[PDB]
Ligand binder design. Sequence first.
Ligand SMILES: *[C@@H]1O[C@H](CO)[C@@H](O[C@@H]2O[C@H](CO)[C@@H](O[C@H]3O[C@H](CO)[C@@H](O)[C@H](O)[C@@H]3O)[C@H](O)[C@H]2NC(C)=O)[C@H](O)[C@H]1NC(C)=O
Ligand SMILES: *[C@@H]1O[C@H](CO)[C@@H](O[C@@H]2O[C@H](CO)[C@@H](O)[C@H](O)[C@H]2NC(C)=O)[C@H](O)[C@H]1NC(C)=O
Ligand SMILES: Nc1ncnc2c1ncn2[C@@H]1O[C@H](COP(O)(O)=S)[C@@H](O)[C@H]1O
Ligand SMILES: *[C@@H]1O[C@H](CO)[C@@H](O)[C@H](O)[C@H]1NC(C)=O
Ligand SMILES: *[C@@H]1O[C@H](CO)[C@@H](O)[C@H](O)[C@H]1NC(C)=O
Ligand SMILES: *[C@H]1O[C@H](CO)[C@@H](O)[C@H](O)[C@H]1NC(C)=O
Ligand SMILES: [Zn+2]
Length: 816
Amino acid sequence: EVKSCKGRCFERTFGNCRCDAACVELGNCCLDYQETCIEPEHIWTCNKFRCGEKRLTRSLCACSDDCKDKGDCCINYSSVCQGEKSWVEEPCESINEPQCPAGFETPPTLLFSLDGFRAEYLHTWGGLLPVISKLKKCGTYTKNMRPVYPTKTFPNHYSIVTGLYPESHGIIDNKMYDPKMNASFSLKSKEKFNPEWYKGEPIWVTAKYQGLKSGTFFWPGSDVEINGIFPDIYKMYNGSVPFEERILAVLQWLQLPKDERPHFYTLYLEEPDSSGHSYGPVSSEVIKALQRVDGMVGMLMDGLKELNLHRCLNLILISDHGMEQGSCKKYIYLNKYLGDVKNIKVIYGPAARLRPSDVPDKYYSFNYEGIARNLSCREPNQHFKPYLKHFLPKRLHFAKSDRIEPLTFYLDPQWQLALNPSERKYCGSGFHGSDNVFSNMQALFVGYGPGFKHGIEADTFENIEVYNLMCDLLNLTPAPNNGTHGSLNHLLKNPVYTPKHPKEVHPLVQCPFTRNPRDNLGCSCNPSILPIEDFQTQFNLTVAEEKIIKHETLPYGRPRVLQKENTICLLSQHQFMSGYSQDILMPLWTSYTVDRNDSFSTEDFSNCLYQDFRIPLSPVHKCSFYKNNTKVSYGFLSPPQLNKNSSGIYSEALLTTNIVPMYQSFQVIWRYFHDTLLRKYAEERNGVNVVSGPVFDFDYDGRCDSLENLRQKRRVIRNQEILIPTHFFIVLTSCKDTSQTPLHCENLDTLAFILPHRTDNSESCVHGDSSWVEELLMLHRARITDVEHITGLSFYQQRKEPVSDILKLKTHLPTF
Ligand SMILES: *[C@@H]1O[C@H](CO)[C@@H](O[C@@H]2O[C@H](CO)[C@@H](O[C@H]3O[C@H](CO)[C@@H](O)[C@H](O)[C@@H]3O)[C@H](O)[C@H]2NC(C)=O)[C@H](O)[C@H]1NC(C)=O
Ligand SMILES: *[C@@H]1O[C@H](CO)[C@@H](O[C@@H]2O[C@H](CO)[C@@H](O)[C@H](O)[C@H]2NC(C)=O)[C@H](O)[C@H]1NC(C)=O
Ligand SMILES: Nc1ncnc2c1ncn2[C@@H]1O[C@H](COP(O)(O)=S)[C@@H](O)[C@H]1O
Ligand SMILES: *[C@@H]1O[C@H](CO)[C@@H](O)[C@H](O)[C@H]1NC(C)=O
Ligand SMILES: *[C@@H]1O[C@H](CO)[C@@H](O)[C@H](O)[C@H]1NC(C)=O
Ligand SMILES: *[C@H]1O[C@H](CO)[C@@H](O)[C@H](O)[C@H]1NC(C)=O
Ligand SMILES: [Zn+2]
């Protein structure tokens, strides 16, 4: 009492220890002077020094006995000064019925972003992060949320609230140039506030049109007039506002009367991204930053508990991207290869892009291909790869927008690129922006509230799926977006949207056998191959025989075509089924099944085709059209090397209906896949269902071109109009359980590819062993959903599983 400042801050005294500002110089302050009298001006917490304090006028919050009555207690008052449990101290309790005030018949959703919180931080430092660890334990968690490319702040935040890829929402980076606008985007510029930049519909706009209000305390686009709308409450970005004030403001919004109180909220903190850059992802500063944000989340949860909203609000704790350690030894300078040239502007970092400096004049006319070829395969194990945006892997969906420079660079993990050492920051800092499948780029996601399941660890999903999920939690109709609505139904207690397989628009045409003359196709067939001598006999199949074929080749149902004006017909064979397009003189898809103990022949089958009498014969279906053709060759969808009955060559696979145009350079990849890889996959998985086909994406928009658009994209080769695929897709399907074969799976294990169809193999740097083919396949892996979008096909429509469980499977991207 006599030795303490409690009750007497700033009052003068004769009785020994002092409690006025002069005491410090004299070193005769009471031991508790700072804690009792000064600290309260600078902190938002109660402590054992402050419990029952005489109210101070300058204190940020109160711990005085009268604080509950005046309603300005520090958030931790009850826990510290009345011995009640904090939110984190309480054991998990399930939230089956929400406990909400009137106005929250639909509960609120809060989107809470920790910038640059890599998923790995929680994997390794969970023991140092009790609040986030408890949200994981009590809630719905994934070890990894996959961000969008490039893995940067504005693209990923705007992707989260729109469900769009950056190529569609238009925010592709923190610095952009738009040629059509002839303007540059910068966060320091006034162009940041120009609505022209922000495409799509953020969830706060979706919400407003359907009568819910929004409160954003910082989010990319929330301080911009998008479709003529701001959030009902928004803050002009000011990184200097302390984290505690942002959280206290959101807690004020949740106490507004129901007429003006938002349903959708955002909260954004700059940590741990800021510390990640400045000190690296493995550092004392990042540990301290992680503990600080853990405490801020705890402050929100304690605040919600005080308001009795902790079993009402749906919390989505999220991050935009991860963080990697940069190195000056892992930075590439283009001036080494190009010299100190002054005609190009190079966007530096791991997501490096190149543009002419003379814009908008030379933006399209500039010789990108020149520099592409100049920078290809210059060193062995080169750590960067030049790509024309349309040749990047389709899984990145990084090409449609004109704001994406025609020449991009793909960089290996930990590697960055600039023009020269002058035009970058510090090379040794932490960075992000790399490929969105790299481990250290993976993001945080925890869902907690009445809408979310409890104690669930979901498989990896993409942040573009979150918009639909938030719409479901708010009973909103989602705007068109790149999420698959229902793919995240497994995260929710009570899904509101039941998805249905899409309807096939035109019913399948039939391609009947027509008697016609055995023609010369100009083939020099290998003697070994037993030809088809009675076609009418060999392809007149009994209902019984067909049921056996269908069961073996379409165990999941036939791919369905969703294209508007398209006429496909089913072609049956003993080892494979196919959907043939008369309009493009080519199959859209084949389906077959390689069994564990099947044989692959090394026997030559070049310059051999057999006529299919089910379709009219065409010049492009003849060996003669391809004989010494320098511009294009051909390849088979269903592989002739695969024989079940004989050990020779499966003759039916040599039909004119099972060939697609194919560059000689691509034949190496295709030959290696069917000869070597497909055999290894069949063995390892105890059988593999295969569906392969061509892909036409001339608009490089990740979508199948219309038949109308395809009629203008045909090339003329030897005075014939031929359509040459942009890509080839493959979809492998085995069982999770290798005890079962692909016709009797309880759970499907899938692996899909969208292989670019290029005239050379410059991408793979072929010099030193066809091991490079596997690397190319992995880099160009895709979600089945990516294949569906780009082919206009829809798979697995006859699996017994509920539709949402299939959508989960189709949106999966594999890791290795
Ligand atoms: C991701 O979802 C996007 C939103 O649905 C979708 O983008 C939309 O793409 C269509 C097709 O280009 C555009 O619609 C336009 O179609 C005509 C062509 O005849 C255009 O001339 C008109 O502008 C018309 O609006 C939309 O503009 C476009 N929306 C946005 C926001 O970009 C993407 O296709 C989806 N991406 C993938 C890979 O599936
Ligand atoms: C950005 O936010 C910071 C902190 O919230 C504001 O800076 C404060 O300004 C007040 C008076 O204007 C000073 O008394 C404080 O000392 C400042 N705090 C700090 C820590 O700098 C600043 O005003 C804000 N800028 C705006 C409104 O954009
Ligand atoms: N809504 C916003 N408006 C403007 N700037 C923002 C906004 N949100 C975050 N920032 C800032 O943009 C910067 C980009 O982060 P990066 O450098 O890790 S890609 C961040 O450091 C952040 O400090
Ligand atoms: C494009 O912007 C540049 C930069 O200010 C300017 O000099 C020029 O007038 C603009 N217009 C065109 C189309 O070149
Ligand atoms: C690439 O072109 C640059 C000019 O920008 C030149 O310095 C260099 O010699 C060229 N490199 C080659 C031919 O690969
Ligand atoms: C094409 O003709 C044969 C096809 O068997 C091939 O061996 C040869 O290399 C090619 N000839 C020319 C002129 O390229
Ligand atoms: Zn960020």
